[PDB]
Amino acid sequence: SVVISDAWRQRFGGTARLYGEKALQLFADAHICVVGIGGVGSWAAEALARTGIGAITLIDMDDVCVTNTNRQIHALRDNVGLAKAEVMAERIRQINPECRVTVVDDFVTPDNVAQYMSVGYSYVIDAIDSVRPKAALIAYCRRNKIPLVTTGGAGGQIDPTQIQVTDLAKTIQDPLAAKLRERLKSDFGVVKNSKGKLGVDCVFSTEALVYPGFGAATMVTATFGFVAVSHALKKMMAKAARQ
């Protein structure tokens, strides 16, 4: 459904060499949504674009702030005060002019989550920090079998080598992930499996949290983003191989 141009092949030849032609087409035909374009999600957006994903949706309504500078790819002096999602969309268009980027200038809420998630995404990357919306987002994708990867807390951590993906039920050292399980259970009835799983893939770190509200670093928060994207692409490729 995207006809790969010669220019696209120039941009993404390295992607073809790594994942294969079938994968290159799969990515070019994919539509991935990132919700929250902050210290995790902005790097996830970047990585999507640089891996030949053919359509990307970004959901956020916040502006670039100078305090974002330590950990968000869109935080540059001339961007300050502009909407994070539009700034990122403009950058994606510079990475891959043929990528179809949509900006939703809104916050996902429990009342609008169904209408936004129901578009038909290949994958959803959840990089929101507010717990009530995040729980609602995860609950919705999970019930509807919308492929999702969610991300735990990326602040207060210095070691990018401790980042990994596991079922949301098995995360450790992560109070955000913990409070999410709580909310899922009580407000959406989401609960453990036969196997002790919630069936929700989560990027988290095993690192014990560093208290000074938390600080953050690019090397860690970006790696959350990148690990979420690589997890998604792996799943998508495994699915495409199966059928």
Question: Where do contacts with its own copies occur on this chain (CB under 8 A)?
Answer: 7, 10-21, 23, 46-47, 50-52, 66-67, 69-71, 73, 75-78, 91, 94-97, 155-156, 158-161, 163-165, 210, 212-220, 222-223, 226-227, 229-230, 233-234
Name the residue nearer to ligand ATP (CB basis): 26 or 72. 72
Of the candidate residues 128, 169, 177, 198, the single one contacting ligand ATP (CB under 6 A): 128
Name the residue nearer to its own copies (CB basis): 11 or 197. 11
Contact flag: residue 60 with ligand ATP (CB under 6 A): yes
Contact flag: residue 68 with ligand ATP (CB under 6 A): yes
Residue 38 binding: pick among ligand ATP, its own copies, none (C-beta 5-8 Å cut-off by kind): ligand ATP
Of the candidate residues 16, 33, 59, 163, the single one contacting ligand ATP (CB under 6 A): 59
Closest chain position to ligand ATP (CB): 38
Of the candidate residues 24, 88, 108, 165, the single one contacting ligand ATP (CB under 6 A): 108
Contact flag: residue 129 with ligand ATP (CB under 6 A): yes
**Three-class HEC string of the chain:** CCCCCHHHHHHCHHHHHHHCHHHHHHHHCCEEEEECCCCCHHHHHHHHHHCCCCEEEEECCCECCHHHCCCCCCCCHHHCCCEHHHHHHHHHHHHCCCCEEEEECCCCCCCCHHHHHCCCCCEEEECCCCHHHHHHHHHHHHHCCCCEEEECCCCCCCCHHHEEEEEHHHCCCCHHHHHHHHHHHHHHCCCCCCCCCCCCEEEEECCCCCCCCCCCCHHHHHHHHHHHHHHHHHHHHHHHHHC
